[PDB]
Amino acid sequence: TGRPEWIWLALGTALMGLGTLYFLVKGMGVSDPDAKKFYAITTLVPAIAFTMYLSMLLGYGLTMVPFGGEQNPIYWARYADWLFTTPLLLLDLALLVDADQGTILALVGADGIMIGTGLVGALTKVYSYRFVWWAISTAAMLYILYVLFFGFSMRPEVASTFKVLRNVTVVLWSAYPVVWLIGSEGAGIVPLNIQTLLFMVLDVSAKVGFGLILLRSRAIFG
Amino acid sequence: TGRPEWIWLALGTALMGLGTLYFLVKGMGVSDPDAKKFYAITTLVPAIAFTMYLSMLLGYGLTMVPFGGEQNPIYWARYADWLFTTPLLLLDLALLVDADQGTILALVGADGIMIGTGLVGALTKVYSYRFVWWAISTAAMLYILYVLFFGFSMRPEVASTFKVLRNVTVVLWSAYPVVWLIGSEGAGIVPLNIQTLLFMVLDVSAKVGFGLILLRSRAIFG
Amino acid sequence: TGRPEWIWLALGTALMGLGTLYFLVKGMGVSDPDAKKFYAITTLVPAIAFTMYLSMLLGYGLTMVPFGGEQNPIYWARYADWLFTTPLLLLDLALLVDADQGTILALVGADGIMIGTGLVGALTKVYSYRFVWWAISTAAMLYILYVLFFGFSMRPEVASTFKVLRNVTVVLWSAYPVVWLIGSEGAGIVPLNIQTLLFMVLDVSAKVGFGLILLRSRAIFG
Numbered sequence: 238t239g240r241p242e243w244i245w246l247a248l249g250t251a252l253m254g255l256g257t258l259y260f261l262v263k264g265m266g267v268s269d270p271d272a273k274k275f276y277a278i279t280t281l282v283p284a285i286a287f288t289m290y291l292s293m294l295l296g297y298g299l300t301m302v303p304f305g306g307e308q309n310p311i312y313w314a315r316y317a318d319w320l321f322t323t324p325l326l327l328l329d330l331a332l333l334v335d336a337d338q339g340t341i342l343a344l345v346g347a348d349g350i351m352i353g354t355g356l357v358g359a360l361t362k363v364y365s366y367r368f369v370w371w372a373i374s375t376a377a378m379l380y381i382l383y384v385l386f387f388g389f390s391m392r393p394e395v396a397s398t399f400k401v402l403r404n405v406t407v408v409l410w411s412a413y414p415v416v417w418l419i420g421s422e423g424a425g426i427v428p429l430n431i432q433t434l435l436f437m438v439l440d441v442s443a444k445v446g447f448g449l450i451l452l453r454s455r456a457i458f459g
Numbered sequence: 460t461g462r463p464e465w466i467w468l469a470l471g472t473a474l475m476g477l478g479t480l481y482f483l484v485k486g487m488g489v490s491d492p493d494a495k496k497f498y499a500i501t502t503l504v505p506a507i508a509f510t511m512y513l514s515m516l517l518g519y520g521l522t523m524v525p526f527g528g529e530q531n532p533i534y535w536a537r538y539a540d541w542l543f544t545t546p547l548l549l550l551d552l553a554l555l556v557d558a559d560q561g562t563i564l565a566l567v568g569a570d571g572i573m574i575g576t577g578l579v580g581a582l583t584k585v586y587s588y589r590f591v592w593w594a595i596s597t598a599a600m601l602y603i604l605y606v607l608f609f610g611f612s613m614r615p616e617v618a619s620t621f622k623v624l625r626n627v628t629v630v631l632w633s634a635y636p637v638v639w640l641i642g643s644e645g646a647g648i649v650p651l652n653i654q655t656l657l658f659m660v661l662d663v664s665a666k667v668g669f670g671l672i673l674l675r676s677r678a679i680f681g
Numbered sequence: 682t683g684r685p686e687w688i689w690l691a692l693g694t695a696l697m698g699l700g701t702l703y704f705l706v707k708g709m710g711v712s713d714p715d716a717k718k719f720y721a722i723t724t725l726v727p728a729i730a731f732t733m734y735l736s737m738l739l740g741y742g743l744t745m746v747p748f749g750g751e752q753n754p755i756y757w758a759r760y761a762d763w764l765f766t767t768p769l770l771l772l773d774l775a776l777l778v779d780a781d782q783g784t785i786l787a788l789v790g791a792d793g794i795m796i797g798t799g800l801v802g803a804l805t806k807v808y809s810y811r812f813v814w815w816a817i818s819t820a821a822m823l824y825i826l827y828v829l830f831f832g833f834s835m836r837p838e839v840a841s842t843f844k845v846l847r848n849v850t851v852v853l854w855s856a857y858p859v860v861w862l863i864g865s866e867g868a869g870i871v872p873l874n875i876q877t878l879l880f881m882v883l884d885v886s887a888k889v890g891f892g893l894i895l896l897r898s899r900a901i902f903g
């Protein structure tokens with residue numbers, strides 16, 4: 238179509254779709270109660286992203302936001318996607334390390350604030366304020382990464398896989414506030430099609446790649 | 460009023476209301492921890508539907524959607540209703556069979572995708588796309604029914620009641636994608652008042668009738 | 682700014698902000714699994730309110746609602762705030778008394794109906810109907826307070842702290858339906874700036890003061 242970013246949305250849609258079907262088939266047969274939780278989460282996440290990418294592709298998950306005296310196309314559906322997939326993702330890490338519930342609630346709450354304020358920032362019409370919400374969102378992100386890095390005796394296999402996905406999480410999650418800032422959502426330093434491309438690549442990395450790593454570990458089996 | 464479907468919304472409102480009060484009174488005295496969960500769920504579900512039916516009756520839970528070059532009255536509040544009551548309903552069946560958490564998360568997630576994409580379909584302005592979302596929603600439904608049918612040793616009483624409500628669930632839930640397709644939401648083969656009538660009858664069946672069956676079983680008691 | 686209520690929104694923002702940082706620092710070091718849940722909740726609640734107060738201060742968490750032939754400024758973000766903080770608050774009391782899950786689900790469900798119908802009331806354009814939703818919301822509140830008062834052997838310390846926060850909860854929560862009724866949201870007997878002032882004072886009392894009392898108790902430690 239007329240939206241140059243469509244190809245990234247179509248590609249994103251296809252890969253989340255393919256990832257969902259992979260994990261869906263991959264998850265067949267799994268009877269270990271613990272393995273099943275990781276499979277459920279890891280299958281659900283790209284299943285949601287699939288529907289959210291398709292809504293952006295079809296034009297539903299997009300709105301227009303006035304700021305800078307300009308009409309800025311804001312794919313709100315990315316935030317809806319993140320609002321559900323990032324706590325699931327954290328759930329993966331919490332179950333991994335048998336996190337305390339209080340810590341999980343801390344993380345999921347901080348996460349909802351993270352996406353919620355990033356959405357608010359994305360939809361805020363007063364340009365300067367966009368970055369106040371960015372800053373607060375980023376602070377919630379930093380809290381989360383802090384908890385994950387310096388909070389989260391497990392078996393060596395758990396500790397081992399946790400360290401991998403933990404380092405993946407930091408680099409990956411940290412890229413999102415940077416893509417937003419430089420992208421058409423924030424400072425408009427990079428145009429929307431490039432920004433969509435970037436977020437697509439991070440999302441598929443976070444929602445299929447991350448799952449491929451997790452589900453490759455015996456750490457998910459009790 | 461001027462909306463011919465009002466009587467079905469008024470009737471739906473009254474019966475969910477009456478059902479809530481019934482289960483509320485019925486639930487008094489129940490001290491068994493397990494029985495209390497089934498009562499909580501089974502009381503909450505029509506309590507929510509009551510508020511959602513009343514919002515449709517009063518005109519709040521309704522929006523207008525352009526497609527087919529027509530202004531289509533979409534009772535979005537039915538989806539809000541379903542978004543909360545159908546996982547509760549699944550919760551009833553999961554607790555029944557002592558489902559694994561991973562399986563519950565699978566089900567609740569698939570359920571949210573089911574209602575979420577059905578809502579998206581209901582609000583989609585490009586007519587053809589309405590049915591893409593229908594198809595995806597229906598696929599999530601089929602997944603759920605698959606899990607419930609061929610996934611979900613329990614006591615004979617549990618197995619017995621599970622089989623009943625399971626068969627009820629399949630026929631009942633399966634009717635919804637058919638009513639949407641033929642109704643003014645989808646192909647416009649049946650007009651809105653008839654479609655509302657149909658959904659009211661299914662909702663009261665799913666939100667009061669189903670609860671009457673469940674709460675009639677000793678299966679809910681530990 | 683031009684909104685006379687801003688100072689109450691700015692003050693509310695500052696105090697929820699200060700409260701969050703206090704509990705955040707206060708919560709450092711806590712390793713007791715149980716204490717951590719109370720800290721997580723009690724820190725998250727004003728963290729959310731902080732973001733919600735700031736959204737009202739900046740003008741994002743506000744919409745205009747036609748009724749009485751007037752344009753009524755409705756701070757929808759207060760309801761978003763409440764929708765998340767009041768179940769957390771109930772969670773605090775449930776964990777306190779080791780509530781049955783069925784009872785918690787009952788409470789959280791009734792709570793969502795409470796805020797959900799109060800939001801619907803706040804956004805309802807037919808003036809009379811505003812109070813039908815108020816009445817239903819209030820009935821859900823009364824249910825909750827009923828459960829908390831005459832439903833919720835614990836150690837004397839638990840029973841002791843529960844009784845305090847329980848009495849706090851009744852007086853505090855009960856003030857909200859009164860402030861809405863007399864405030865510009867309901868009968869317009871008290872103007873919006875006064876109404877905002879009132880809700881700010883209740884919110885800080887409920888979201889920082891209540892937490893200061895809870896976190897002051899050894900009842901939160903296993």
Ligand SMILES: CC(C)CCCCCCCCCCCC[C@@H](C)CCCCCCCC(C)C
Binds near residue numbers: 259
């Ligand atoms: C361990 C196995 C079986 C791996 C195969 C993965 C297949 C699943 C579906 C396709 C997507 C997954 C690949 C993960 C890679 C990412 C981090 C990002 C790649 C995105 C872009 C397309 C190029 C890569 C492909 C492998 C599709």
Ligand SMILES: CC(C)CCCCCCCCCCCC[C@@H](C)CCCCCCCC(C)C
Binds near residue numbers: 474663664
């Ligand atoms: C087991 C007992 C006590 C049963 C009595 C149920 C009473 C509760 C409130 C009213 C509604 C419930 C009836 C369930 C029946 C449905 C499947 C659908 C009937 C809807 C339409 C009205 C006609 C039936 C009535 C019984 C109200």
Ligand SMILES: CC(C)CCCCCCCCCCCC[C@@H](C)CCCCCCCC(C)C
Binds near residue numbers: 696
């Ligand atoms: C037990 C200790 C350390 C108490 C100190 C609390 C400090 C935290 C942040 C500021 C707010 C908290 C005070 C709670 C009081 C309320 C019930 C309402 C007071 C609101 C208005 C401002 C005046 C009071 C202040 C103490 C800020």
Ligand SMILES: *C\C=C(C)/C=C/C=C(C)/C=C/C1=C(C)CCCC1(C)C
Binds near residue numbers: 322323
């Ligand atoms: C899809 C899955 C994941 C891992 C996405 C991660 C999302 C974030 C870490 C987003 C963070 C944001 C911040 C910190 C500030 C700007 C707004 C964002 C929501 C993009």
Ligand SMILES: *C\C=C(C)/C=C/C=C(C)/C=C/C1=C(C)CCCC1(C)C
Binds near residue numbers: 544635
């Ligand atoms: C109220 C309670 C229940 C049991 C309602 C069930 C709802 C569904 C099974 C709805 C399914 C839909 C699908 C499959 C596709 C069209 C959109 C719907 C959301 C109606």
Ligand SMILES: *C\C=C(C)/C=C/C=C(C)/C=C/C1=C(C)CCCC1(C)C
Binds near residue numbers: 763816854857
């Ligand atoms: C912020 C924290 C808390 C304790 C707020 C409590 C909120 C309520 C008890 C609100 C109740 C309402 C009712 C009963 C009817 C009018 C609408 C309200 C949502 C204000």
